Amino acid sequence: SHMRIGILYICTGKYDIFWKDFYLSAERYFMQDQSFIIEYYVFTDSPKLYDEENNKHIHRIKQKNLGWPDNTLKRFHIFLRIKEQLERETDYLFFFNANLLFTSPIGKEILPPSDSNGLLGTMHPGFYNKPNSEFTYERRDASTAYIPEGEGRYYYAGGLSGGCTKAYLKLCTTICSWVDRDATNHIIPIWHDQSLINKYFLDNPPAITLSPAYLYPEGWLLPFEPIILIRDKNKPQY
Ligand SMILES: O=c1ccn([C@@H]2O[C@H](COP(=O)(O)OP(=O)(O)O)[C@@H](O)[C@H]2O)c(=O)[nH]1
Ligand SMILES: CC(=O)N[C@@H]1[C@@H](O)[C@@H](O)[C@@H](CO)O[C@@H]1O
């Protein structure tokens, strides 16, 4: 029985060093109720992950480094490679960036209701209480991620997205079609990683919208307490 939770994680290249503290924080804060089984789906090129030889929930998946911009553009194309084992092993899906870190215990409060659409979005830390006129949406009608001015509620970031497995997999398949449709039209959506997810969140507003506290950049001073910290990529330790 219990509730199955799946974590989508990509750390190809030099971002594999972010897995250690992320895993140690997820095992201490993220879903530690007795009704939660947590599964790690790590997409990397590293031959072995941290605590992989001890933990069985850590699924090392073959994935080379695609570089820019395919590492953020073809992100959802990677998730569909194992979409056959995702719905059978998980009930909820969650995507976190590499350099993310848990600081506060996260429970069932971020779980979308059973009646709603079952989607999850996170407000961008750079756009809090800023007007719609300052949103960096895709303003080209030729692209599939096009959002006209005046429309939209929040500016969702691509650093953190989730929801139930059934609704989240449809989200991935929808965007993948939007990427390939733009590839044929010789056009690249901007910003590809977050503009595409805002177009979907406009057509399909998420059940619950997380504050930028779950995407708090390290060093900033934002009007909320940091729950999930975006670690600085340019630190001497990294
Ligand atoms: O070589 C790379 C570059 C990026 N990422 C992933 O892409 C996400 C966003 O990275 P970002 O675009 O901020 O890095 P940049 O492309 O600016 O170097 C992160 O969660 C990384 O895990 C990756 O796996 N390998
Ligand atoms: C790198 C990051 O956190 N993402 C975005 C970046 O892509 C760009 O949209 C910028 C200005 O809108 O806001 C952030 O820095």
Author numbering: -1 to 236
Tell me what the authors wrote about this structure, in their words.
Bacteroides ovatus GT6a represents a GT6 clade found in more than 30 Gram-negative bacteria that is similar in sequence to the catalytic domains of mammalian GT6, but has an Asn95-Ala-Asn97 (NXN) sequence substituted for the DXD motif and metal-independent catalytic activity. In previous studies we have functionally characterized one of the two GT6 from Bacteroides ovatus, BoGT6a, finding that it has a similar specificity to human HBGA synthase, catalyzing the transfer of GalNAc from UDP-GalNAc to 2′-fucosyl-lactose (FAL), and similar acceptors to produce A-antigen-like products. BoGT6a has a GT-A fold similar to structures reported for bovine α3 GT and histo-blood group A and B synthases (GTA and GTB) but is shortened at the N terminus by 45 residues or more as compared with the mammalian GTs. The structure comprises two contiguous subdomains: the N-subdomain (residues 1–97) that includes four parallel β-strands and three surrounding α-helices and the C-subdomain (residues 98–246) that includes a three-stranded mixed β-sheet and a small two-stranded β-sheets associated with two α-helices.
A monoclinic crystal form (form III) grew in 0.1 m Bis-Tris, pH 5.5, containing 0.2 m (NH4)2SO4 and 20% PEG 3350, and diffracted to 3.50 Å. This structure includes 16 protein molecules per asymmetric unit that contain three different ligand configurations clearly shown by their electron densities. Monoclinic form III was also prepared with protein that had been preincubated for only 1 h. It is less ordered than the form II structure and has 16 polypeptide chains in the asymmetric unit that comprise three groups. (i) Chains E, F, G, H, O, and P have intact UDP-GalNAc bound to a compact conformation similar to chains A and C of orthorhombic form II and designated structure A. (ii) Chains A, B, C, D, I, J, K, and L have the hydrolysis products, UDP and GalNAc, and a more open conformation similar to chains B and D of orthorhombic form II (designated structure B); in this group, the GalNAc is displaced and reoriented relative to that in UDP-GalNAc. (iii) chains M and N have hydrolysis products and a closed structure in which the GalNAc remains in a similar orientation and location to that in UDP-GalNAc (designated structure C). The surface diagrams of the three forms show that C (chain M) is slightly more open than A (chain E), whereas B (chain A) is the most open form in which both the UDP and the GalNAc ligands are exposed to solvent. However, it should be recognized that these are structures stabilized by being incorporated in different locations in the unusual monoclinic crystal lattice.
